[PDB]
Design a protein around this motif. Structure first.
Motif, short mmCIF file in Angstrom:
data_model
loop_
_atom_site.label_atom_id
_atom_site.label_comp_id
_atom_site.label_asym_id
_atom_site.label_seq_id
_atom_site.Cartn_x
_atom_site.Cartn_y
_atom_site.Cartn_z
N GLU A 228 0.86 -1.18 0.00
CA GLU A 228 0.00 0.00 0.00
C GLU A 228 0.90 1.23 0.00
OE1 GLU A 228 -3.21 -0.21 -0.36
OE2 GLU A 228 -3.93 -2.07 0.55
N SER A 229 0.31 2.42 0.13
CA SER A 229 1.07 3.68 0.04
C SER A 229 2.09 3.86 1.17
CB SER A 229 0.10 4.86 0.02
OG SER A 229 -0.62 4.95 1.25
N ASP A 230 3.25 4.40 0.82
CA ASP A 230 4.33 4.67 1.79
C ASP A 230 3.88 5.60 2.89
OD1 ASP A 230 5.90 3.20 0.10
OD2 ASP A 230 7.03 4.90 -0.68
N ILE A 231 4.53 5.46 4.05
CA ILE A 231 4.35 6.38 5.15
C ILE A 231 5.53 7.32 5.15
CG2 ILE A 231 4.05 6.66 7.64
CD1 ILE A 231 1.83 5.02 6.13
N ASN A 232 5.25 8.61 5.07
CA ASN A 232 6.28 9.62 5.13
C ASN A 232 6.23 10.25 6.50
OD1 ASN A 232 7.60 9.82 2.42
ND2 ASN A 232 5.47 10.05 1.79
N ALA A 233 7.35 10.19 7.20
CA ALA A 233 7.43 10.65 8.57
C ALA A 233 7.39 12.16 8.66
CB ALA A 233 8.71 10.14 9.21
N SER A 234 6.79 12.66 9.74
CA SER A 234 6.89 14.06 10.09
C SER A 234 7.88 14.17 11.25
CB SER A 234 5.53 14.61 10.51
OG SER A 234 5.64 15.96 10.89
N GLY A 235 9.11 14.58 10.94
CA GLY A 235 10.20 14.49 11.90
C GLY A 235 10.46 13.02 12.22
N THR A 236 10.42 12.66 13.50
CA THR A 236 10.57 11.25 13.91
C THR A 236 9.23 10.58 14.28
OG1 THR A 236 11.10 11.94 16.18
CG2 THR A 236 12.94 11.57 14.67
N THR A 237 8.12 11.09 13.76
CA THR A 237 6.80 10.52 14.00
C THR A 237 6.19 10.01 12.69
OG1 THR A 237 6.37 11.89 15.94
CG2 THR A 237 4.44 10.99 14.80
N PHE A 238 5.78 8.75 12.71
CA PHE A 238 5.18 8.08 11.57
C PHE A 238 3.70 7.89 11.90
CE2 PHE A 238 9.06 6.65 9.33
CZ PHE A 238 10.01 6.93 10.30
N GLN A 239 2.82 8.62 11.23
CA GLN A 239 1.38 8.44 11.43
C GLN A 239 0.93 7.34 10.51
OE1 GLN A 239 -1.67 11.64 12.20
NE2 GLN A 239 -2.51 10.95 10.25
N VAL A 240 0.36 6.29 11.08
CA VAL A 240 -0.09 5.16 10.30
C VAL A 240 -1.59 4.93 10.51
CG1 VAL A 240 2.20 4.13 10.54
CG2 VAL A 240 0.35 3.31 12.00
N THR A 241 -2.24 4.46 9.46
CA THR A 241 -3.65 4.09 9.56
C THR A 241 -3.79 2.61 9.27
OG1 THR A 241 -4.54 6.29 9.03
CG2 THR A 241 -5.98 4.42 8.66
N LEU A 242 -4.54 1.93 10.13
CA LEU A 242 -4.75 0.49 10.00
C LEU A 242 -6.22 0.23 9.70
CD1 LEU A 242 -2.98 -0.09 13.41
CD2 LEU A 242 -1.86 -0.03 11.17
N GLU A 243 -6.50 -0.33 8.53
CA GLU A 243 -7.88 -0.63 8.20
C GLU A 243 -8.39 -1.77 9.07
OE1 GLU A 243 -9.26 -2.86 4.55
OE2 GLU A 243 -7.18 -2.36 3.97
N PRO A 244 -9.72 -1.92 9.15
CA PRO A 244 -10.25 -2.91 10.09
C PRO A 244 -9.73 -4.33 9.82
CG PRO A 244 -12.00 -1.48 9.29
CD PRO A 244 -10.79 -1.19 8.45
#
Length: 390
Positions: A367-383
């Motif tokens: 799926e689509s890459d996660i691009n970090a904001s500084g040292t924080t990776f916001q991720v979304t997990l589908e059900p």
């Protein structure tokens, strides 16, 4: 929605030894050439297994049946451990156990002969290009209705008085349920502990509260910790693709790694209708659950302290590749709702994660890459999903 987790790359836990499952070419059909590649290769549609478990036959005329799959597993980069179910019948005697007659145990005067039998197997496999990583005293000594029983004290005597003569790493005690009464005597006796190399355990019915092991944390320096056999949550015929049932596999693995500090996780039969590989040779939903760990968390990676349960129904583990300090995170969402996690990874220079996702309708989909904001990776997990971030 907005839950938080921290992965601490400086808080190293256990070194990962690997993942895999059982071959038993006497009880069932051997893995085929194709199936060996699917199990131990790490290409697309392959499990990336790095541990093969095999059995030590009581009848030495069956030993050659192990060689072809063992060699191939090693050729593809796996390590091999071997577990016996029974000593040769001429070392065994019957006894009555808790009212049940005709049970099997190793004769007390044949413990030396048993050592020689185990060494003979080690030597034989080594002669055939299979350098065993370890050999076990007994498979499930405490659930041996259909094989050979060892009490905690019989296991201790062997570990204390004989096990030092085995020309291999020694694995014990492989309790069917990680019952600590089988291993505590080994850990509390310095000579027996010195002769132990790997504390092996099975996970049949093992609950999370019984996965930590304070005595092993205290006394087990220099010993490995392996979960050497399980299937979960059942061995129902043709159940390997059941969804969301399969999510229990990922959860059990997560629990082994994070709650039990296990360095290895080894399924029962690799190829079976309730196993990671189906009879048609393809990967089952259960297999894809294993693959989320086995294809990405490679031997030598080290688990690191990470928020294990950042929100209800969400489970997170993280391992560090020490060669470049990259991180692999495996995140399970058992909720029927989507979940968003802010994962803080302080001190990392990494700013991008790729991700593979499995649900009821897709297997390790990139799926689509996660691009970090500084040292924080916001991720979304589908059900009802498992995601591995790399």
């Amino acid at each position: 929605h907005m839950a938080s987790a921290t992965i601490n790359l400086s808080a190293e836990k256990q070194v990962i030894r690997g993942f895999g499952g059982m071959n038993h070419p006497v009880w069932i059909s051997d893995l085929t050439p194709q199936q060996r590649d699917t199990a131990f290769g790490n290409g697309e549609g392959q499990l990336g297994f790095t541990i093969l478990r095999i059995h030590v036959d009581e009848n030495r005329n069956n030993w050659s049946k192990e060689v072809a799959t063992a060699r191939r597993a090693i050729e593809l980069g796996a390590i091999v451990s071997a577990s016996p179910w029974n000593p040769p019948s001429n070392m065994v005697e019957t006894f009555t156990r808790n009212g049940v007659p005709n049970q099997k145990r190793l004769r007390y005067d044949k413990y030396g002969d048993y050592v020689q039998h185990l060494n003979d197997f080690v030597a034989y496999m080594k002669s055939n290009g299979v350098d065993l990583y370890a050999i076990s005293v007994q498979n499930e000594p405490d659930y041996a209705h259909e094989w050979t029983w060892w009490t905690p004290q019989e296991m201790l005597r062997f570990m204390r008085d004989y096990a030092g003569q085995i020309n291999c790493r020694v694995m014990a005690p492989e309790s069917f349920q990680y019952l600590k009464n089988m291993s505590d005597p080994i850990l509390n006796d310095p000579q027996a502990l010195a002769n132990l190399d790997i504390l092996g355990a099975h996970f049949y019915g093992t609950t999370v509260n019984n996965m930590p092991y304070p005595l092993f944390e205290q006394k087990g320096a220099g010993k490995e910790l392996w979960m050497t056999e399980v299937y979960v949550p059942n061995s129902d015929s043709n159940s390997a693709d059941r969804w969301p049932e399969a999510l229990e596999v990922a959860h059990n693995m997560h629990n082994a790694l994070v709650e039990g500090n296990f360095q290895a996780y080894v399924w029962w039969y690799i190829r079976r209708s309730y196993g990671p590989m189906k009879e048609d040779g393809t990967i089952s939903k259960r297999g894809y659950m294993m693959a989320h760990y086995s294809k990405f968390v490679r031997p030598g990676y080290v688990r690191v302290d990470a928020t294990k349960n950042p929100t209800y129904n969400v489970y997170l583990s993280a391992c560090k590749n020490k060669k470049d300090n990259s991180v692999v995170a495996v995140v399970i969402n058992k909720s029927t709702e989507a979940k968003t996690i802010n994962i803080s990874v302080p001190g990392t220079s990494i700013r991008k994660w790729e991700r593979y996702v499995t649900t009821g309708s897709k297997n390790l989909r990139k799926e689509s890459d996660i691009n970090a904001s500084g040292t924080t990776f916001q991720v979304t997990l589908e059900p009802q999903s498992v995601t591995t971030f790399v």
